[PDB]
Amino acid sequence: MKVAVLPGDGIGPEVTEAALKVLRALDEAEGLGLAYEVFPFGGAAIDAFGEPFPEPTRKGVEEAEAVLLGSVGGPKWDGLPRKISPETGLLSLRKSQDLFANLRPAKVFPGLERLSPLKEEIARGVDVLIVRELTGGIYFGEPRGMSEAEAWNTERYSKPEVERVARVAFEAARKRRKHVVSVDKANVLEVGEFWRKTVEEVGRGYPDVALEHQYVDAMAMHLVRSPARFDVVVTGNIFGDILSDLASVLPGSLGLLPSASLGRGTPVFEPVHGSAPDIAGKGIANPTAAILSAAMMLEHAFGLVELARKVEDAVAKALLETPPPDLGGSAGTEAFTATVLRHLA
């Protein structure tokens, strides 16, 4: 288990270490063979090195089996060439590993249904994984243009593009509830139709997973009306972008969410939340997303499903007994971790 840790800025260092606390606990208990190294990245790298993703790091990530990322950026670096901004470093990391799928879970922890914008009856049991295609679609599609009279943008997809992302959805599903929902716009768009036909074909290779298809428009209504019925959801770049933001509001605290990006290279696990520089060094940062990313790591990069679920379990309980401030509570960073560990051992 060779992990590259890129603590990042602001609260990165503190929340990341909390994850490490957890990984370290499991290595000891389960004899996992954990081997990790921390590398400069983000604001910290620009400052110590003049650039966000220095060669030692790049080499660091390439020689590892997983990257655990903290948070990156802040006001301190809002005014530099894009050539060397924290965000560009993130962008480069992702490209260097040719990461084509973005994984984003949305789950309502038993007893935390109160923070959801939805009624409790509906919020209860939500546990959805949105798999978004990250390299193709309209966002990158050519021809693109603007006039004084019109503007155009092309939504285009290749069989191989659809194929790869679909493959990650099926593999993701087998480790979960083995139920996949592909989202297209088949009734109206050629692209939609092509996407549907390809996922159906790929699907033949995974008899152990149920496959269903839905219109993005229908899917939007369903993520509100009965989000508890989905497992894995896969779709294009723009639709996945919309559907993950939507789903991200279900649990009611955009601070509890981890995120993973898979592809050909070393996989990246990272909390969805920001840097929150105001809080750096105070203790108090909620390590929940960092821990949940550590857990994403065990499952998706190491296939250690059993453990990932163990950890998820621990945080679920930690959240109830010693909820952090962000959840109307007082447990600071260390306090919270401690309680997670307690349900670990």
Place this chain on the structure above:
Amino acid sequence: MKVAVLPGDGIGPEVTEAALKVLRALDEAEGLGLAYEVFPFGGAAIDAFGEPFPEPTRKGVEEAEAVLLGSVGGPKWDGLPRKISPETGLLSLRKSQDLFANLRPAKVFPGLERLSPLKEEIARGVDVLIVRELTGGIYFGEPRGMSEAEAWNTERYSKPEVERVARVAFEAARKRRKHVVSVDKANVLEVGEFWRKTVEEVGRGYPDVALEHQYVDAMAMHLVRSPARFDVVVTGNIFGDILSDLASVLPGSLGLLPSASLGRGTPVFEPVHGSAPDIAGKGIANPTAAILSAAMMLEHAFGLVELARKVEDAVAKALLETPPPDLGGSAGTEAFTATVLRHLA
């Protein structure tokens, strides 16, 4: 006030007449000058005439100032050439009047917040009008295509296309809360950027209305988290399609929703719900959407804002005191109307 009534199929005839009951009540009270004629349309037209939109009707709609539509279609006609299917008649109606904007309100009636999938605190006070562009975008965009290797679809927009729909949003807003939100994908797409720049330009002509812009992805999160802060929302075809389905689930009963389509020709007002043939002639059909379309008609086609609000008010109360079966109640069609009239006079 020359209205063309196209009762349609199934429960159309019954719910439409209930609206008429209401219009008739107001004409008497307010001396409105109402003059309407009922014309064959849908399943009924195919059967009596061999086609869904016979010339007497077409001529009917063209010589009127507003079209009040009931519901159209059913199993009875699910198997005919598309040349003459009910749905094609709808499609033709809309094209013959060159209707470019689709208006769809989503409101949570005081005290009906219980039917919303959202928590009451959040559901309370929702009253949003989604204005969707209906003729352009990706749905109609060329070049389009499919291969065995790839598929493409173009999202394209002309200044004049954006201009017209924006104009209907500003005009719609002045009659409401004078607050418009334009939704684009400006940060990533040329099209997005072009749409934003044009709505901002058009906007200069309406100093009396506040204009704000949002990313569709952000908007999706907002329609769940705090839908009560919007008034009028305007966007492209696909985004408007997604955003209206999303918003349609807020009130928790897809049977209470009216809909309007505006453009160059005679405007069309119609309930969102289906035919529900199982119920035809039993009484029991919920006329709420038909009445709310009648009200949409007063506001949008006749500028009778004051009245539309009077009617809306009446139905709000009817819903509470004599809720129809669909809302766990017993008031049938006539019963419900009667109670609406009561709060009318």
